[PDB]
Amino acid sequence: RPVTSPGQHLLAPEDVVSCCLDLSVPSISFRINGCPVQGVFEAFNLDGLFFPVVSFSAGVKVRFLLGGRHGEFKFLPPPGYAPCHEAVLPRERLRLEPIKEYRREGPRGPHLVGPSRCLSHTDFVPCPVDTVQIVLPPHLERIREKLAENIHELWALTRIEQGWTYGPVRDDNKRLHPCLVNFHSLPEPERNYNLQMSGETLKTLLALGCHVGMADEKAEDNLKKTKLPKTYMMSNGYKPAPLDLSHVRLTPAQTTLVDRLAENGHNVWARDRVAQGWSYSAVQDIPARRNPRLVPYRLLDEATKRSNRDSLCQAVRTLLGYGYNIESRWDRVRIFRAEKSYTVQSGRWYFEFEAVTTGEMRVGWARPELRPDVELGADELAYVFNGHRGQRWHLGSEPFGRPWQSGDVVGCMIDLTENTIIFTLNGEVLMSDSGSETAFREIEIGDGFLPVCSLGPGQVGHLNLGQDVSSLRFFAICGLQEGFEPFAINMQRPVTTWFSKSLPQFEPVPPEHPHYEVARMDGTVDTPPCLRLAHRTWGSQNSLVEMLFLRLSLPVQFHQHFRCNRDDPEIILNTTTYYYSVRVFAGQEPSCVWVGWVTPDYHQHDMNFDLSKVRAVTVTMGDEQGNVHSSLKCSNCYMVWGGDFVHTDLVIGCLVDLATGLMTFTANGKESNTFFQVEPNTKLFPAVFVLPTHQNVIQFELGKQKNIMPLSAAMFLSERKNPAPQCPPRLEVQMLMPVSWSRMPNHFLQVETRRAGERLGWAVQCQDPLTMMALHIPEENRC
Amino acid sequence: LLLQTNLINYVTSIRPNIFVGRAEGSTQYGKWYFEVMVDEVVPFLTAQA
Amino acid sequence: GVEIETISPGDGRTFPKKGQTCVVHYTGMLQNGKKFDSSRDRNKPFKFRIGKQEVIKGFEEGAAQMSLGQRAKLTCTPDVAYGATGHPGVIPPNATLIFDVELLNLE
Secondary structure, eight states: OOOTTTTOOOOOTTTTEEEETTTTEEEEEEETTEEEOSSESSSSOOSSSSSOOOOOOOOOOEEEEOTTTSSSSOOOOOTTTTEEGOOOOTTTTOEESSSSSSEEOOOOEEEEOOOOOOOOGGGOOEEEESSSOOOOOOGHHHHHHHHHHHHHHHHHHHHTTTTTTEEEEEEETEEEETTOOGGGGGGGHHHHHHHHHHHHHHHHHHHHTEEEOOOOHHHHOOOBBBBOGGGGOTTTTTOOOOOOOOOOOHHHHHHHHHHHHHHHHHHHHHHHHHHTTOOOOSOOOOTTTETOOOOOOOOHEEEEHHHHHHHHHHHHHHHHHTTEEEEEOOOOEEEEEEOOOBBBBSSEEEEEEEEEEEEEEEEEEEEETOTTTTTTSSTEEEEEEEETTTTSSSSSEEEESSOOTOOOOOOEEEEHHHHHTEEEEEEOOOOOOOSSSSSSOOOTTTTOOOEEEEEETEEEEEEOOOSGGOOOSSSTTTTTTTTEEEESSSOOOOOOOHHHHHEOOEEOOOOOOOEEEEEEEEOOSSOOOOOEETHHHHSSSTTTOOOOOEEOOOEEOOSSSSOOOOOOOHHHHHHHHHEEEEEEOSSOOOOEEEEEEETTTTTOOOOTOOGGOOOOEEEEEEEETEEEEEEEEEEEEEEGGGGGOOOOOOOEEEETTTTEEEEEEEEETEEEEEEOOTTTTTTEEEEEEOOOSSSEEEEEEOOTTOOBBOOOHOOOGGGGGGSSSSOOOTTOOEEESOOOOEESSSSSEEEEEEEEETTTTEEEEEOOOEEEEEEETTTTTBO | OOOEEEEEOOEEEEEEEEOOOOOOTTTOOOOOEEEEEEEEEESSSSSSS | EEEEEEOOOOOOOOOOOOTTTEEEEEEEEESSSSSSEEEEEEEHHHHHHHTTSSSOHHHHHHHHOTTOEEEEEEEEEETTTTTTTTTTTBTTTTOEEEEEEEEEEOO
């Protein structure tokens, strides 16, 4: 969308782009060379976290300016905005990284990388167990007092070791503190605060489910106090004397109790500060109410976690000393396999797989028909070895071998003459429980076998097909003398690899789908052509019930330019309005049906779909001083909910006017309030999102109304002036499939990232060009 | 009807490791600012812009 | 007529005069986004002289208003771009055309 700025020109050297992100009212604004750009994005979703990003091709050199010790800002930020360098987490260091890379360079070659774990916006909200429930156990009141007393003695000792001494008025420079007195000599409000805190340690133990009760009535009179030298004496005669708890040893459950008591206490304090209005920040700023440690305990520094943890440990050890006893689903696995043209049906073959990490990784042999959405070994199409825990997988799991360590190399050998598969670890042949030297036997030849591997989240592995025989590390040790050959010996180019891409795509419904059947009904005298969907396994055991995303195979395209019981022949021949309806059969809940249109760029596939999850954004344009003159609204899904129109079938009709971009809906002949407006060049696919609840689910009715043409007149050029409804074979129902196979590119762009300096910021550089020949499918607008 | 072919350039995205967001009771700030300075761009390294 | 949207500023002083040979690089695309022609693929600047009906009217009307080194978008209406007949096999009837034009040299 064109935008107006003083001196419009494409990005040229010496240009500085300032980006502002405001979340109080969702808005993104830009400034170029100090001049504002008259255009803003607004009213967008808030379902995730936002990060700065630059996209570029070969031939660029840019620098990130983040402020502070990093790239100094050339222009002053607008009031109230904070530099992005303040948002760095305590446990992480600033760096530049790619986005969801599945491949990287390594010392000896390419390293395959699995999915990366990402944080969520909910991970920054503190969630304490703190409930309104109060304990006030009368049997724990004495120990509350004794606990507070010992905590004070320990605190005073910690102060005195660090050079603090008594004085009636606190002085941080001279390290004078008035609390360096006997506990009983503290002011009443300070004593009461200490007793409250001791009581809340006890109440938090109880809220965590601990059983706290007297077990050794002799323990208290056997306690001794630590006897410090006179150098620990204050001028008022006070010398701390904490209990000698050297004999106390936390049990594992008690250690766990300390680890739980401190995290909850920190979270309660965090949420209290949030309620008081403070916010997390590296640059502590008391007047600005910004605190570096105002973050949940999951993400905290180890130094403070260990510090606060020790006070709570001593509290629990004090109690013991007194004799108390205290008692998505698909973006997870990434499958890499060789191309089908390398299928082997004979001979003996060898390859290696190095496990950089020790997590969930499987490696082995697979048939060409391997399915991308099934974990390796869950079916009969793969013979794999799971190295996280020594297991062999084929139509189930059985123990085999031992778990590997970091850097271990697994040598997979297949013998098609003896029909056997052998796995070796670090040159040593793996051994089963029954003494069988072969993992699998009597394997059928069939189509053949291909090397395959699967990686879980955060896993790194190196695959070596043996193109360079010298690169193999154990081939000579085990495999050479038995007649095995490298899988890719005598090959001019590296073997092309395919990976399972988790990008949802619409594909035709298989004719033999076990659960879903589509019947093409011919148009009778009183009924138009229909496409009825039926569930062929409803009610029986193992029936699959889940959200179904359906669409028609052909779109309707709006015109390039907009204007400023018997059909009338001139109106019907000059109209630009088209109609189609969907009949939801009786028995299917209307509350689980959404009917409308989808743009070709819909890839959501949400199992908890609602109209609130639909992506939306408003682009607002204005002049140099405001005066909004254009506010367009963009979305990829224009649908209505069937629950707004509530033993009888419901026939929801949809009307689109191609000459104005206006879309309207009808419910049982009654006009609905909802309507939509679209741009001239928009392509819309008829789509239905449904959760089945009956044998008969829906039925696309390709009919017509009075003086309104059917869909085939807009979908087919030869039928533009034909009012007779038609359902040609090309029009079919497609369902949204989650995962598909994709080919890995042979070469990747070389990007150089480095810190140019404190004031210059972080530099990105790319020079080498790369070009590929893309095949574009017109109707789907994808290549 | 017929499939179309053409030569296109590769494009790569780079992002810093800073994540911000908004949620009920969250401790994160709401307004953020950053700058990007362009030092060298070749208008036409290949036939495509 | 012809609309001009500048993409990169030119010298803004040297304009094409009568009789001069202009040498430009262009990419010609349809309004739907489909590319139909580009001199950069042939790696050869296109040369033409002004005022001798050697090209479609809109193209030379746009290039006449451009300065040395300028990069601009030219929009051409059907009434001037090949009219109703179009171009057999390449351009359909009543096609509004988009040209990315850079004025490289004159004479």
